[PDB]
Nucleic acid binder design. Structure first.
Ligand SMILES: [Mn+2]
Lengths: 126, 127
DNA sequence: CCCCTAGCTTTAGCTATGGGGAG
DNA sequence: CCCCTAGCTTTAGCTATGGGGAGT
């Protein structure tokens, strides 16, 4: 459930989705395997909580908990950016067949239900 | 439902709650009236979408849509900070009875349900 | 709507409530 | 757990995945 940063009590979870360039179904086999590895590593390094993360031929789906003071875009930037660089060094076709691994676009959807009774305990905890 | 910033397709809504210092029930009458006014003004200025916002004696409750690239804490900072300064200039007791209007704490809860079928249209919209 | 730019990491490749520009 | 600091607006009063020092 909830977690607390310096004086900020939060529960922030997002549904993030992004596709490779031209929607090329390259996220398969060893590539999708490596992709998830690097993102988990990034998440640990950026204190991001990876909840759900399944990969599909032409897109990835991540559900993460991120400190509102940190920023979703910051996580996405390291995720997309590092993956592209690292992958393009291992899987050569990613570099030759595509100018970049990803696009400058992503899908962000906030997830969570109105947590009544947790609001009241917060208030009384003040 | 969804809005698009430069290449980012988003739907980010938060439930924000914060209380005045010492939980002093000062957010009533003309004070609560002015509080909501200023926040609405701030929201317009920061392109924040004020959905729900009711005030209570010892705490405010806001439900807003915020561009993920902008940041929730940025909106919160301007909201708490501006309100505190402006209010304490109008309602004198707020300055004399309290050292500051708010505390350095707030409650942030993400709200929204898994939008299947919007995910797919996004993907297919990627050409 | 697209190419450029500054900012920052991956020092390559992605973000910036981004910018300026058609005509 | 708290007081200080830099950053930024409100130029007062609030944030910073904040900091550093005392600390069951
Ligand atoms: Mn899917």
């Amino acid at each position: 459930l909830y977690k607390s940063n310096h004086n900020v009590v939060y529960s922030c979870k997002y549904h993030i989705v992004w596709c490779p360039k031209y929607r090329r179904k390259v996220l398969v086999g060893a590539v999708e395997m490596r992709l998830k590895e690097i993102i988990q590593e990034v998440a640990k390094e950026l204190r991001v909580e990876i909840i759900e993360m399944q990969t599909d031929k032409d897109h990835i789906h991540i559900l993460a908990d991120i400190d509102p003071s940190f920023g979703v875009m910051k996580f996405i930037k390291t995720a997309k950016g590092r993956s592209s660089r690292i992958l393009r060094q291992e899987f050569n076709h990613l570099k030759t067949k595509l100018p970049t691994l990803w696009t400058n676009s992503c899908f962000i959807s906030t997830v969570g239900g109105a947590p009544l009774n947790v609001v009241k305990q917060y208030i009384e905890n003040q």
